[PDB]
Amino acid sequence: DTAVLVLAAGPGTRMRSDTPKVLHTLAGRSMLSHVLHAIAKLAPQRLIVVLGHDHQRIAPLVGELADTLGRTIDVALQDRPLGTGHAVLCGLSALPDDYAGNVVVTSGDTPLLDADTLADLIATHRAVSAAVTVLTTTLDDPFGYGRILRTQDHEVMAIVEQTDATPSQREIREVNAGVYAFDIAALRSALSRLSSNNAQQELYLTDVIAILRSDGQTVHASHVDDSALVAGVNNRVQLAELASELNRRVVAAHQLAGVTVVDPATTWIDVDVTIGRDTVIHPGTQLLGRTQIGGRCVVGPDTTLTDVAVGDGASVVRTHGSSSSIGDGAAVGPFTYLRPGTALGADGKLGAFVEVKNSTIGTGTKVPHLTYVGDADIGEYSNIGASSVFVNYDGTSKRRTTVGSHVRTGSDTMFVAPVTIGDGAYTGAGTVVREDVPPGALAVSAGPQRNIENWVQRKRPGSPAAQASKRASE
Amino acid sequence: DTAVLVLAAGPGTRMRSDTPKVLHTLAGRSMLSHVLHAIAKLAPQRLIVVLGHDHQRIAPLVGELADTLGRTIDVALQDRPLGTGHAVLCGLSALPDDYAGNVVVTSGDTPLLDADTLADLIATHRAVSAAVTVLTTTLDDPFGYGRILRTQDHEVMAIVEQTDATPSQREIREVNAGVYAFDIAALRSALSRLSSNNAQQELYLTDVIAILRSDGQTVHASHVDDSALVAGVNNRVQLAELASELNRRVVAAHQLAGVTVVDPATTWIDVDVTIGRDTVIHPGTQLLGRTQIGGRCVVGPDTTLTDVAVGDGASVVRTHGSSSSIGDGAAVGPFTYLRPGTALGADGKLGAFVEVKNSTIGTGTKVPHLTYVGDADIGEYSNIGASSVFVNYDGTSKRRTTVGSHVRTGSDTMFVAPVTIGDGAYTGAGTVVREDVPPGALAVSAGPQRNIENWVQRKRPGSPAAQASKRASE
Amino acid sequence: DTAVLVLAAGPGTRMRSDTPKVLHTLAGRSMLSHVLHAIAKLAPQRLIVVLGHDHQRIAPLVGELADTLGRTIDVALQDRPLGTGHAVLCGLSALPDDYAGNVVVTSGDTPLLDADTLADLIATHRAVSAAVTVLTTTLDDPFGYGRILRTQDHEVMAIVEQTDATPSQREIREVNAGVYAFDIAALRSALSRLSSNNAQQELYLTDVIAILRSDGQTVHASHVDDSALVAGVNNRVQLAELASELNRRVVAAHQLAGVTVVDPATTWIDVDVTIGRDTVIHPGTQLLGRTQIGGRCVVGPDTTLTDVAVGDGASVVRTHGSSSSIGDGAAVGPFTYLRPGTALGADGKLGAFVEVKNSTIGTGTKVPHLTYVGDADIGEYSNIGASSVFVNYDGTSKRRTTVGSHVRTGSDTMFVAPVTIGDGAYTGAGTVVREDVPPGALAVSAGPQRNIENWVQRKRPGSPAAQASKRASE
Ligand SMILES: CC(=O)SCCNC(=O)CCNC(=O)[C@H](O)C(C)(C)COP(=O)(O)OP(=O)(O)OC[C@H]1O[C@@H](n2cnc3c(N)ncnc32)[C@H](O)[C@@H]1OP(=O)(O)O
Ligand SMILES: CC(=O)SCCNC(=O)CCNC(=O)[C@H](O)C(C)(C)COP(=O)(O)OP(=O)(O)OC[C@H]1O[C@@H](n2cnc3c(N)ncnc32)[C@H](O)[C@@H]1OP(=O)(O)O
Ligand SMILES: CC(=O)SCCNC(=O)CCNC(=O)[C@H](O)C(C)(C)COP(=O)(O)OP(=O)(O)OC[C@H]1O[C@@H](n2cnc3c(N)ncnc32)[C@H](O)[C@@H]1OP(=O)(O)O
Ligand SMILES: CC(=O)N[C@H]1[C@@H](OP(=O)(O)OP(=O)(O)OC[C@H]2O[C@@H](n3ccc(=O)[nH]c3=O)[C@H](O)[C@@H]2O)O[C@H](CO)[C@@H](O)[C@@H]1O
Ligand SMILES: CC(=O)N[C@H]1[C@@H](OP(=O)(O)OP(=O)(O)OC[C@H]2O[C@@H](n3ccc(=O)[nH]c3=O)[C@H](O)[C@@H]2O)O[C@H](CO)[C@@H](O)[C@@H]1O
Ligand SMILES: CC(=O)N[C@H]1[C@@H](OP(=O)(O)OP(=O)(O)OC[C@H]2O[C@@H](n3ccc(=O)[nH]c3=O)[C@H](O)[C@@H]2O)O[C@H](CO)[C@@H](O)[C@@H]1O
Ligand SMILES: [Mg+2]
Ligand SMILES: [Mg+2]
Ligand SMILES: [Mg+2]
Ligand SMILES: [Mg+2]
Numbered sequence A, B, C: 001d002t003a004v005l006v007l008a009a010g011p012g013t014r015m016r017s018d019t020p021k022v023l024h025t026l027a028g029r030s031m032l033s034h035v036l037h038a039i040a041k042l043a044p045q046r047l048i049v050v051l052g053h054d055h056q057r058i059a060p061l062v063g064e065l066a067d068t069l070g071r072t073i074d075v076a077l078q079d080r081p082l083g084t085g086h087a088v089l090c091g092l093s094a095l096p097d098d099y100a101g102n103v104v105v106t107s108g109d110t111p112l113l114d115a116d117t118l119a120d121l122i123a124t125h126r127a128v129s130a131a132v133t134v135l136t137t138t139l140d141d142p143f144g145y146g147r148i149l150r151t152q153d154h155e156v157m158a159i160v161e162q163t164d165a166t167p168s169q170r171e172i173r174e175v176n177a178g179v180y181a182f183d184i185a186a187l188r189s190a191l192s193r194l195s196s197n198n199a200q201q202e203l204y205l206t207d208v209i210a211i212l213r214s215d216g217q218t219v220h221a222s223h224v225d226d227s228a229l230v231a232g233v234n235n236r237v238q239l240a241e242l243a244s245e246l247n248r249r250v251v252a253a254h255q256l257a258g259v260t261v262v263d264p265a266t267t268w269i270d271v272d273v274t275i276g277r278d279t280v281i282h283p284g285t286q287l288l289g290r291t292q293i294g295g296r297c298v299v300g301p302d303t304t305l306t307d308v309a310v311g312d313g314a315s316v317v318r319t320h321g322s323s324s325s326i327g328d329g330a331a332v333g334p335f336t337y338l339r340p341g342t343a344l345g346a347d348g349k350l351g352a353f354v355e356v357k358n359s360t361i362g363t364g365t366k367v368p369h370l371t372y373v374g375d376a377d378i379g380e381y382s383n384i385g386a387s388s389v390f391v392n393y394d395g396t397s398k399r400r401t402t403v404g405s406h407v408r409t410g411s412d413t414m415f416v417a418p419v420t421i422g423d424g425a426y427t428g429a430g431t432v433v434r435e436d437v438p439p440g441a442l443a444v445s446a447g448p449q450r451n452i453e454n455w456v457q458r459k460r461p462g463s464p465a466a467q468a469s470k471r472a473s474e
Helices: A029-044 A055-069 A084-090 A114-127 A184-191 A208-214 A238-258 A454-457 A464-473 B031-042 B055-069 B084-092 B114-125 B185-192 B207-214 B236-256 B457-458 B466-471 C033-044 C055-069 C083-092 C115-127 C184-191 C208-212 C236-255 C455-459 C466-473
Strands: A002-008 A046-051 A074-077 A102-106 A132-138 A147-150 A156-160 A172-181 A218-223 A267-269 A285-288 A304-310 A318-327 A336-338 A342-344 A349-357 A359-361 A367-373 A376-378 A389-391 A400-405 A415-416 A419-421 A440-446 A448-450 B002-008 B045-053 B074-077 B102-107 B132-138 B147-150 B156-160 B174-183 B218-225 B265-271 B283-289 B304-312 B317-326 B336-338 B343-344 B351-356 B359-361 B366-374 B377-380 B389-391 B401-403 B415-417 B420-423 B440-446 B450-451 C002-008 C046-053 C075-076 C102-107 C133-140 C149-150 C156-160 C174-183 C219-223 C267-269 C287-289 C304-310 C318-328 C335-338 C343-346 C349-355 C360-363 C364-372 C376-378 C387-391 C402-404 C415-417 C417-421 C443-446 C448-451
Touching: A002 A029, A029 A046, A029 A055, A029 A102, A029 A114, A029 B218, A046 A084, A074 A084, A084 A102, A084 A184, A084 B114, A084 C174, A102 A114, A102 A184, A114 A132, A132 A208, A156 A208, A156 A218, A156 C236, A172 A184, A172 A218, A172 B236, A184 A208, A184 C304, A208 A218, A238 A267, A238 A400, A238 A464, A238 B132, A238 B236, A318 C184, A336 A440, A336 C208, A342 A349, A342 C267, A349 A359, A349 B351, A349 C287, A349 C349, A349 C364, A359 A367, A359 B185, A367 A376, A367 A415, A367 B366, A367 C364, A389 B351, A389 C415, A415 A419, A440 C455, B002 B031, B031 B045, B031 B055, B031 B114, B031 B401, B045 B084, B045 C115, B055 B074, B074 B084, B102 B114, B114 B132, B114 B218, B132 B207, B132 C083, B156 B207, B156 B336, B174 B351, B174 C102, B185 B207, B207 C466, B236 B265, B236 C236, B343 B351, B351 C349, B359 B366, B366 B377, B366 C349, B366 C364, B415 B420, B457 C443, C002 C033, C002 C083, C033 C046, C033 C055, C033 C102, C033 C115, C046 C083, C055 C075, C075 C083, C083 C184, C102 C115, C115 C133, C115 C174, C115 C219, C156 C219, C156 C287, C174 C184, C184 C208, C208 C219, C236 C376, C343 C349, C349 C360, C360 C364, C415 C417, C455 C466
Parallel strands: A002 A046, A002 A102, A046 A074, A132 A218, A267 A285, A285 A304, A304 A318, A318 A336, A318 A342, A336 A349, A342 A359, A349 A367, A359 A376, A367 A389, A376 A400, A389 A415, A400 A419, B002 B045, B002 B102, B045 B074, B132 B218, B265 B283, B283 B304, B304 B317, B317 B336, B317 B343, B336 B351, B343 B359, B351 B366, B359 B377, B366 B389, B377 B401, B389 B415, B401 B420, C002 C046, C002 C102, C046 C075, C133 C219, C267 C287, C287 C304, C304 C318, C318 C335, C318 C343, C335 C349, C343 C360, C349 C364, C360 C376, C364 C387, C376 C402, C387 C415, C402 C417
Antiparallel strands: A102 A172, A132 A172, A147 A156, A147 A172, A440 C448, A448 B440, B102 B174, B132 B174, B147 B156, B147 B174, B450 C443, C102 C174, C133 C174, C149 C156, C149 C174
């Protein structure tokens, strides 16, 4: 049995944000959410998040994740950020006084941390009967991290913080990941002996290592080769680095599963996105939220999709869209804007400079150019001519349009809702449609063409046009 | 004299694709095509591709390349993938039984392999009178590759496959490139002695090394410092890595020749693309197929061009286009879509939200905004007003429009083909042009403006508009 | 007291450009301009730029920077590029013959060089009373650079040029940065003894080191750990590398100050750009020139902004724009084109496929779709319907439109300037507005809808439309 505590009550100063650190996102999830998904996979008996003065903005997101993960997540409050050691005391207060399981401590800012690394930590801690096992790694740039002090035999003696380390300790490149397993009694005991006598003037959880070494307890440091899994995030440079690294891993997983990603460095794929076999994702693409792509699709470059379902064989190129679905075999783009509530049927087409909002568009139906579709239902195998608008707003209110199947509407038609265009109807180029159109009818409104001869010589003489026109007489 | 065999009959399982591995593209060519271009530059006497159960989809592409490279390329069939050693036996069957030239073996999945490396391999093999010379390299991550076994004197003893290697052999970082020169007799002899007694249960070409060492033949391994040249591709992660590396080399070549590429990491340049001196390519650009850019052009960011010819001094910004040509000094973009058959004359302009298909557009002519040009011929120094459409499709059929020179067509004109607009003609804003327009004439159709006074107070009271309008009385 | 000489008179052959090297830009400044900003921060007494045969195109930019930096910058002419040693003699000619301050020499192609490194160089040179102090660094790839010759005690003996170096000297990885401090007398003396007897056949400034060592003068080489600060640019590959590295540093500075940059590798930020706290910049974005972004903005991906001011809380997504301003809380994009002279008020909206030029657009006013706004003034809380055009050009001349406040103009309105639309006015869908519209009036022009029944059966039989329409009878 084990309790996991997640310390998330620090002020996050180096982020320089009014958004609490923990809540900063990479790959579709907040760091906190990443940390909690990871721990919930491990299924510990207790899971406690220690929150600080902004608990009121985080505690509710904690409940949301508790509900998603199908479990109970407690919140402990740390009313002043007196240090990671103090934070752990707060977290302990949320366990029974006689709790006898192991205590794993982790941070809310170690977003790649994964259930396997935590299970390994707990297994190791048990195998060697440690009073404390700490995870460590070794980095080229160790700046900011606690340094792991070891004798030549590899026994850990202490951890020393960046701010308290001599120039010589600072050369150490093995660092504290801030991820620990503890025997509960040993932890409580050593926490009670902590002193704020140090540079930052805090109660350091890291002191517990040297304390327990002194007591003659067993102290184990377990080295994590894959540094990324235990990398922290204290500022926005580190956040983009880990987002980038997490993204590489997500992209590689999709590649090994049969998805061709032309340029992984510029293809951002959120963690819940699924993509079918043999799809091709061109550079500059973001697939966000719960986006789902079928198999054999082309995801045209420079495409951003958030919560969009794309069926098999579809093509989605230079498109910006969200909360929409794109049927099998449909063609979308280039330069297309899908707003929430777009439903494009199989083999449909939304072409260049087309914007769709809250509209359903039947099988086989094409909106190829320069057109706005708002609040409409359009049937099957219909064609909406270029440069048209579904006028869904009269000033003051929202109005609906219904277009039948096999319709051909002429270029530059304005559908002034509410209006219904019957099956097989046509609308001439340049029509303002204010009344219903019966099935099979032609609707027109433009007046007759009138050619005014010699207008150019008479109203624009001797413009380049008047001269060209005079040459044409000959 | 030398015969080159290219083994391309394996199943490509780790690609997880219904597209045969060899046929996967980087930089405008299939890997197979890359491998064959490289070999054909070397001009060997015989060149044989060993194909497997999907030979019917590859053999024809082989003929295409034979025809392009001006040479004969034979195909040998391997009806079951029994191993690289077995594959080479298949390839040999396509040589005369008394062939006495050297045999070079290579894979169809080593797409950076180049004629210089192959010529070096053949020269070395000859200089040392080896029975077999194998190319090797050394990598940070040797996973998947055969390991090169050498005594402390650097003599090669054997090659051992990833799957058959002890944990200790796996530490070796010098790997088999899968690129060999053989004395024909030595090869035939050693191939006949191969055994399927190993992890993968195949006839390994790699065993030939240890076999010939045992026979007391001369065995040479030649180390290739530039690893990329001999890197293989077994899955889509490795394919994107080599595409990325190949792309860096193509971009650097254009840079050293006088082309400023703002961000090489995001500029994808196919191998046949040519670009003139002092052009600037902004980030996010792909130049594909047989695209040709003149000198002093600007290739606006986020541009994708496939088979597009761009003359000197042109500007092509945020544009998506294919099979089109863009004259000297023309301006295209931002947000412009060129479909096949676009011909934009010198100093022409295709502006924002303009889409052109199958149209010729004369010198000096401008289509600046929000417009669709389909199946049209437009003369010189003409201006097409904003928000216009060449209505090229009547329902049921494709129709053509001809526009003269020095024309000025008004905004929101619909050209309902087939129609001809004479030289120097104008068309008022809002015109639906259904009849020919004589040179120098003004064509109009919109009815007269009618101002209905007090409509807002009476039909939208006291909307914000009614209130504003009531304030304006005062 | 110290004089800084900047050698910028070489021919820049390896750039293969008709644009003089020095004038090639990264991050919004020419390399020369970068070098001069850096030196002017140091505030030396004299600053002299040595120019060559293209002095006439550079000398004026030098005056511009002199004027911006609030100082005097002299130009010395080198009429033939006889070598860096000869160049320095030219530069000296612009100092009094009795000048007694230190001479710092630097290149015009070391664009990351910074005032701190130069101050350190001068302090070191003084601390050790050197006759010459040279800056050096150590690189993985030392190709092209002079090699630093040192005895085992670390005393510098000489510098040897790439072209004159034995294969063994070429293994040296410590290189000359081309950045020197000199005692003036020692420099003049050693320059007079230079010989053109070497591969390139030039007067090498680098020979001065071995000369002064021989004289028994003190010679100091000061090692710069951060190589980038002293990296040179001789060709366009090196220029993109340093632009990339400079960009990383600019982006990291904004990140540490509170700006979330999703993908630093694809976010290009010029050196004068400022960005407020908690803004988010999505991938593919360039912020150029004097662009200024407020706090809490979203800079939608694929956005390019040059000299654009964006207020707080604004959103700017998939937008291409320049010389424009975007008010607090405004929404711009996706797919929007801002031309010079755009002023979008607070809470304004410019939506998808909208292009604006030289127009002022009041608080709260919305141009949501498919529309061109040219040469217009539009008041507050107005709405411009979809697919509209401000027709600002009559053929021959530029015309202005004024639109009041709280106006609602219908879709597909053409504003044929000059025209004024009064407060609270409406314009029906499909209107060509040629006359002024009074406050509160409705302007229309389209003719009445006419439904021609059975047109489809009679003019398109038995098209799919005729069949659908016949089915609808039942
Ligand atoms: C998206 C693209 O880029 S192309 C795709 C979608 N399409 C289009 O714009 C197709 C547009 N085509 C048109 O508007 C055409 O003029 C068509 C199909 C309606 C005209 O068909 P037509 O049969 O050739 O001539 P027709 O004589 O039958 O039409 C009869 C009546 O309507 C009129 N009329 C025809 N088109 C229009 C129009 N666009 N506006 C106003 N009136 C019109 C006539 O003037 C005629 O009336 P009348 O009997 O007073 O003369
Ligand atoms: C792309 C851009 O953003 S701008 C570029 C391209 N251009 C345009 O849209 C320019 C548009 N301009 C127009 O339509 C203008 O009204 C112009 C140039 C035709 C009007 O010119 P005008 O000479 O000022 O007035 P004019 O009195 O001569 O025209 C005469 C006839 O056609 C009419 N007419 C003029 N413009 C139109 C029109 N757009 N629609 C219908 N009828 C019109 C009159 O009502 C007049 O007929 P009448 O004699 O019954 O009165
Ligand atoms: C941007 C978007 O996607 S939506 C946003 C901006 N908006 C729009 O396009 C809103 C467009 N709406 C329209 O054009 C509408 O027809 C409205 C609001 C003007 C019509 O309002 P209405 O009050 O319903 O009918 P109404 O009877 O009052 O208008 C009266 C007169 O003008 C006419 N008329 C109305 N709209 C138009 C029009 N678009 N073109 C020509 N004439 C028109 C009538 O035919 C009537 O004249 P009459 O008295 O001969 O019959
Ligand atoms: C003294 C200490 O522990 N330092 C460790 C901490 O450094 P680091 O400087 O990263 O410590 P932080 O400031 O990030 O705080 C640790 C975490 O605990 C929480 N918190 C912090 C302070 C507090 O008073 N209350 C509270 O709840 C914060 O949410 C934070 O996420 O993690 C590093 C790895 O990431 C380790 O190398 C360091 O050894
Ligand atoms: C046993 C063997 O040779 N392994 C080599 C092979 O590994 P690797 O595991 O890459 O070998 P592959 O599975 O790629 O097969 C080699 C190539 O030969 C062809 N093929 C393969 C099997 C077959 O039965 N018939 C056939 O024609 C395939 O098209 C393939 O392209 O290349 C590596 C470098 O890339 C080398 O380091 C390995 O030493
Ligand atoms: C002989 C010499 O000095 N070589 C140095 C030079 O190499 P490198 O080959 O880069 O020297 P360059 O050709 O760049 O010339 C140096 C600079 O001086 C100016 N110039 C050059 C030649 C001339 O006749 N007149 C003139 O004014 C040029 O503007 C140029 O910017 O810089 C390198 C670092 O960047 C150093 O490692 C080399 O030791
Ligand atoms: Mg931290
Ligand atoms: Mg009309
Ligand atoms: Mg392989
Ligand atoms: Mg240089």
